[PDB]
Amino acid sequence: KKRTAKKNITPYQRGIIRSLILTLDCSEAMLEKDLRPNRHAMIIQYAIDFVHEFFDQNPISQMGIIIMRNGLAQLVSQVSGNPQDHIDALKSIRKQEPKGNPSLQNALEMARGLLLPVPAHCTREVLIVFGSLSTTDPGDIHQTIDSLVSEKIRVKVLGLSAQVAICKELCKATNYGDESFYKILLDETHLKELFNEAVTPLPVNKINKGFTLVKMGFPTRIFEDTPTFCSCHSKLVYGGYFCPNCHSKVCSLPTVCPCCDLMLILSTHLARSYHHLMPLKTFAEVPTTEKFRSEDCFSCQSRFPXXXXXXXXXXXXXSRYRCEDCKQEFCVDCDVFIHEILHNCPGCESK
Amino acid sequence: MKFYIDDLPVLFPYPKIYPEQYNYMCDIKKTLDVGGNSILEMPSGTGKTVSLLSLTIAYQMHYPEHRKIIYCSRTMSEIEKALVELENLMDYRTKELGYQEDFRGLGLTSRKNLCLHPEVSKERKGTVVDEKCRRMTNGQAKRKLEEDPEANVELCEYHENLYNIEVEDYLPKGVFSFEKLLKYCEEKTLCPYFIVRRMISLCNIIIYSYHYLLDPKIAERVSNEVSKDSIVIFDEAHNIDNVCISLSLDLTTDALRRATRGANALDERISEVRKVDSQKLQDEYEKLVQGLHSADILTDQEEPFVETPVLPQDLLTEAIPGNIRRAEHFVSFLKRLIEYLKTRMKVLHVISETPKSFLQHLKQLTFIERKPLRFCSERLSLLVRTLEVTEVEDFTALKDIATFATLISTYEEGFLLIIEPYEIENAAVPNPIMRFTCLDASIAIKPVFERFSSVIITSGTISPLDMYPRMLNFKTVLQKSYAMTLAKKSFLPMIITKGSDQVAISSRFEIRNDPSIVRNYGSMLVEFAKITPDGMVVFFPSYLYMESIVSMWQTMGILDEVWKHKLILVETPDAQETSLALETYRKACSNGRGAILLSVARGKVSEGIDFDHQYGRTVLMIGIPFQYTESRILKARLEFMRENYRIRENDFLSFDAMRHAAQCLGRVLRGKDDYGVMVLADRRFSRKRSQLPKWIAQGLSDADLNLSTDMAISNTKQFLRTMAQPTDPKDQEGVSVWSYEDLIKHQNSRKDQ
Ligand code: SF4
Ligand SMILES: [Zn+2]
Ligand SMILES: [Zn+2]
Ligand SMILES: [Zn+2]
């Protein structure tokens, strides 16, 4: 009655400052009806949610879009920080329809240049949503794959209802051999979290360069809405932040400094991570007889957690998934939820 | 690993291990001790070779008695397959248990592969390769090299320097696979063709084509060191029968005519030399008048011109060829021969002649005698040996006559000569085929089989295990069919008896286009071509039969659509083009974009090559293979086969097609990592479920019977999707992958009964 990601073992290192380029196949292959309007629509559909979902857990990570039609790599959205720009770029395409084959080889190389500008710390990383069963590669590939590795470009693909060796090779090679990234869905619902699991950072057993100090500053809000002006959109922004150093206005964002070129976040963006940094050991289910704790949830307050002797119901499930490190109990949904939304183990918080 | 089979450490080189392998080795060792023949169905989807070599190597090095090993292979591909295999097992043997091994073993393949001197290495035909590599180091030519070293003498030059250093003991210790051997011998300038030829005398394990064990003219130099009683391994020998049929002999009259002039060229040669240097020829007569001249009728260090088409230098006699002792007597009767043959050449219709029936008939139309008839070859052999000719292509034909003569002198009543007046394919033209053929495989099998009781045979596709003991009459012990153990799908078989229109699809109907089937077949192919990722092959019952399908499909709009998805590669009759094409097909499969290949089950592709995961994900058996496209050759052979053995053509027929049908499929899987889809496309397969190799039919489920395309495509559609999941339980694999040194300890301690 359990399927648990046993140990939260980075254990000490995960890739926070990310630079993810999402690439989508846009081919007639995407026009087959396994998915309702097509795969392609559900894709762009499921892509949309992803963006916030991404930017939610990653308010510090640039991102851009690529489509693959007519055997062509065709950037749609410059890699940037705002979600909305990215977000809108989809719907536009979402109505348009794919044409011609997918040229994977075109894809990566356009990325390979695309991911060059980002700093060293930024995880240079790509994600693929392949739809076809083969490719149309204008040039070599096995050589091309290697070039990625030379650039330390992790990749990950979301295979369609099949497996193709080359990408299966691609992930394996590009994740320094150690592979898990060639996931291909078997069910649509799987695809849902398939995006969601892509949200988090992604080390396993890493090699360690010099991970340096990251210079950055913090802006401060303004008051006079009338005095509107701007310095990144040059519009009349009612009034916003100011560089701690450049000391110039900026449209509200976690943006970089359009005046003296540095990263400017608040802090919450940092805070948004830390649950990614040190997550929690799962709350453990309890014995069918040994619990004998209060007849009321701790986190929540639900009287049950058992059934007070109900033949094949009370002994059926010790509804007492409970924490170890604080050794205090917890409700069913609570542990479902405290592991989900806010992590912050209450029992382990208060002692 | 290093465990016990109740008597022997098992220096297993693969940490993970499969229960069948032990189930395998357990039985063969049992068979190893108490001599037997006792074939074994072994699903090669696992490592059968390691399972073999594991038991063997220790058993050689554990017990003291049998210091030699004989492992016979279908082809050099098998050779090189096994060569690297043992080498790493052998290398693992040094890594884990020091070095107490002193074991060397290698395989001879040919001149053409092993002729390292670039001259004939450029040249193609092995006989010419045989001719010049002879002329490289030939008894006359080496005498031309030693007695009269001249510009007419060209050589590999290695067999000299090889002889300089090599022939006192081996190169140091390696089981030098061609990868290792071809380089290593190049550096020290060796054509290892002679390295092994001398090393014949040394190695404790050997590997070569069944011919080298069965082709008597090459399987002649059998020595007690190389043979006496050691262990025999026949791997993938499901098709051994057809190999024994070796004693095949058909008569290209056109080549035969060239032989006549070659005979005259000989006739002129002997006459002209008897004019000039007849004394040593008379001395050869004196080398003849003594008796058999065993000194140089058998021993020739680089000379022997004609091979021994007879069994390995046994079926001969000693009484001289009477008069023919005089070559002029001898030359004359040879002309009697060809002319008799030439006389027999132009029979209006097909005529089948049993040897004895033909025997006096020879004497009838020309009073020749059988006793000289065998003597021809050696008498010829010395004759050309005495005259150091500049070519053999003429004389190949000549010796073939002698070879024919010897053969027809040799055997009877199990063998027969038939002359169709032509090839009926383009009938009513002059091209008669004085075909004299073997009929019983076992006869050629008997001798080597007679020698040693440590005889072992196994293919990945032996089915059924009865015909071979039936056909060869041989005395087996145990024949166990090995159910492949799977805790998972691991592959998919399918049967398409009918299409979407439920129209039964076949090939026995004709070699022609019942347009329903092929139009149905375009669909079948294309939808599959769509669904699978790269790597897919199809097989056809016959080349030109396939040609029909293609041509019509080419006309239809079928091909272009699949051209959209995958890449297409046909099979060719020539090997060269094929050989090129194949590697590309590998490259496309290895590369991203999908591809597809077509060939024929009887084809050389189906015989040697192998298909892994990317290289093969789906196969297709278009139709059920058959051969009565051809003539009584089988039937006349069937006569003896059927009249003696309680076998009907169908018995032979229905099995042998399967003997070739699954023969393709075994290549589809290499490691238990791999998987694939195996479809069958013919109505009659439904009746044919009961002839498969056991592990196949076990892998075959009932509901897959007489599937149509629609029902088929779903299962693959899932199976592909399903298998593509990282289906890694990593816990139930204890039973199926036998927790290493522990569960084999555990379960076989529990399997102690
Ligand atoms: S001498 Fe050696 S290398 Fe040269 S042709 Fe003969 S076998 Fe080949
Ligand atoms: Zn602005
Ligand atoms: Zn600034
Ligand atoms: Zn806690």
mmCIF file of C-alpha atoms and ligand atoms in Angstrom, chain B residues 110-121 128-130 132-137 154-160 162 190-194, ligand 1:
data_model
loop_
_atom_site.group_PDB
_atom_site.id
_atom_site.type_symbol
_atom_site.label_atom_id
_atom_site.label_comp_id
_atom_site.label_asym_id
_atom_site.label_seq_id
_atom_site.Cartn_x
_atom_site.Cartn_y
_atom_site.Cartn_z
ATOM 1 C CA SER B 110 40.172 -20.301 -45.614
ATOM 2 C CA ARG B 111 42.941 -18.909 -47.726
ATOM 3 C CA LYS B 112 40.899 -15.966 -49.007
ATOM 4 C CA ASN B 113 40.277 -14.570 -45.547
ATOM 5 C CA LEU B 114 43.702 -15.581 -44.254
ATOM 6 C CA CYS B 115 45.853 -14.931 -47.310
ATOM 7 C CA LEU B 116 47.583 -11.899 -45.842
ATOM 8 C CA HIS B 117 49.872 -11.244 -48.795
ATOM 9 C CA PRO B 118 48.143 -8.393 -50.648
ATOM 10 C CA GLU B 119 48.492 -9.963 -54.090
ATOM 11 C CA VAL B 120 45.819 -12.651 -53.928
ATOM 12 C CA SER B 121 44.199 -10.665 -51.136
ATOM 13 C CA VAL B 128 42.355 -18.764 -57.580
ATOM 14 C CA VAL B 129 43.270 -17.738 -54.050
ATOM 15 C CA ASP B 130 43.964 -21.425 -53.544
ATOM 16 C CA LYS B 132 48.165 -18.584 -56.297
ATOM 17 C CA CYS B 133 48.645 -19.161 -52.566
ATOM 18 C CA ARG B 134 49.583 -22.633 -53.677
ATOM 19 C CA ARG B 135 51.770 -21.006 -56.311
ATOM 20 C CA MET B 136 53.026 -18.887 -53.431
ATOM 21 C CA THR B 137 54.230 -21.905 -51.436
ATOM 22 C CA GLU B 154 55.982 -15.237 -56.290
ATOM 23 C CA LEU B 155 54.933 -16.030 -52.754
ATOM 24 C CA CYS B 156 53.327 -14.681 -49.633
ATOM 25 C CA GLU B 157 56.973 -14.918 -48.474
ATOM 26 C CA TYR B 158 55.524 -15.403 -45.020
ATOM 27 C CA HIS B 159 55.401 -19.200 -45.200
ATOM 28 C CA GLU B 160 59.173 -19.000 -45.476
ATOM 29 C CA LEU B 162 56.753 -18.297 -40.786
ATOM 30 C CA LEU B 190 52.594 -14.092 -41.535
ATOM 31 C CA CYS B 191 49.822 -15.403 -43.689
ATOM 32 C CA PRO B 192 48.345 -17.258 -40.710
ATOM 33 C CA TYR B 193 46.632 -19.600 -43.150
ATOM 34 C CA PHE B 194 49.824 -21.569 -42.712
HETATM 35 S S1 SF4 C 1 51.345 -17.090 -49.001
HETATM 36 FE FE1 SF4 C 1 50.001 -16.703 -47.205
HETATM 37 S S2 SF4 C 1 49.363 -14.533 -47.445
HETATM 38 FE FE2 SF4 C 1 50.201 -15.178 -49.462
HETATM 39 S S3 SF4 C 1 48.379 -15.901 -50.617
HETATM 40 FE FE3 SF4 C 1 49.251 -17.741 -49.613
HETATM 41 S S4 SF4 C 1 48.112 -17.889 -47.647
HETATM 42 FE FE4 SF4 C 1 47.746 -15.784 -48.435
#
